[PDB]
Write a sequence for this structure.
């Protein structure tokens, strides 16, 4: 029958329900369960594609379904190798489906934790692997900022790891369009976690590409800690005061000197003294693996 999915998503993003088969639960998303599946005929030149399936049930408020659909509309536009791709929507039935790119190794945070010595194919990353993760994440962020978007929520848990270990930005629920103004000021109650927020965001609810760079600094820290909680030993309220007044995370034990210096540049108190993601990628480009030049935003005509 007739519902929000008939109205809020263009019919040319539509994909037939019978081209979709669901296989198992992947995890809880922000609107419903996420599943793994196979899509017959949704990717270019590929007969079948393994996919992630997001659902919203018939028994979900119209309000949340509209939010689900709007959130999909935003992602529609993002086509970058380091951003998880939206492949289409199944609107003509129930439950409503959004078909995503499958990232077989899940979210970066719990992937990093799985690397801790406490699977023959899982070992703590070398400096070289960490640089790769860094450039790939920075690339996807360069891409966003270039299309005049602020993520507002960069963190390991919001990145995903592919089968070949490629890392991509994977959650966009909090992104804001900053064409024209170059900042987003939060009016009222916000739900972003304090331990990933810039000093200026904490103080005035201001968000820019600079505050995204701050968060990037924090995910570097997560990579170097195999995903420990930032500012452990402080409560959320103590993090707010610590970070707002210029406090910084300590260099992780055994952390490559290079990585920590990069964090320090990201954690400049004055947002304007931070590097851009383009500058970050530029400083480590010769350490990226060969395939980067053919797939990144960095070496694209867009850039
Ligand atoms: O692949 C995925 N793509 C998405 O767009 C997505 C969006 C929201 C949510 Br919640 C999940 C996904 C998604 C998830 N992939 C995903 C893949 C595997 C697993 C389970 N394994 C256990 C240890 C290694 C991994 C969990 C999540």
């Amino acid at each position: 029958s007739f519902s929000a999915a008939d109205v809020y998503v263009p019919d040319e993003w539509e994909v037939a329900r019978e081209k979709i088969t669901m296989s198992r639960e992947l995890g809880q998303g922000s609107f419903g369960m996420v599943y793994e599946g196979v899509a017959k005929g949704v990717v270019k030149d590929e007969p079948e594609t393994r996919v992630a399936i997001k659902t919203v049930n018939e028994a979900a408020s119209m309000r949340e379904r509209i939010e689900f659909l709007n959130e999909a509309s935003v992602m529609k536009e993002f086509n970058c190798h380091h951003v998880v791709r939206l492949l289409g929507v199944v609107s003509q039935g129930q439950p409503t489906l959004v078909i995503m790119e499958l990232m077989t190794r899940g979210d970066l945070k719990s992937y990093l934790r799985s690397l801790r010595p406490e699977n023959p194919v899982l070992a703590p990353p070398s400096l070289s692997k960490m640089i790769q993760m860094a450039g790939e994440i920075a690339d996807g962020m360069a891409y966003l900022n270039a299309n005049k978007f602020v993520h507002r929520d960069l963190a390991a848990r919001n990145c995903m790891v592919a089968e070949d270990f490629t890392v991509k930005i994977g959650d966009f629920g909090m992104t804001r369009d900053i064409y024209e103004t170059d900042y987003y000021r939060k009016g009222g109650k916000g739900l972003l976690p304090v331990r990933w927020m810039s000093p200026e965001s904490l103080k005035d609810g201001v968000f820019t590409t600079y505050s995204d760079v701050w968060s990037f600094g924090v995910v570097l820290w997560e990579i170097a800690t195999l995903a420990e909680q930032p500012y452990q030993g402080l409560s959320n309220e103590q993090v707010l005061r610590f970070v707002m007044e210029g406090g910084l995370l300590d260099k992780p034990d055994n952390c490559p000197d290079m990585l920590f210096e990069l964090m320090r540049m990201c954690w400049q108190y004055n947002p304007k003294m931070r590097p851009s993601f383009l500058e970050i990628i530029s400083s480590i480009k010769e350490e990226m693996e060969p395939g980067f030049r053919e797939v990144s935003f960095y070496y694209s005509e867009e850039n």
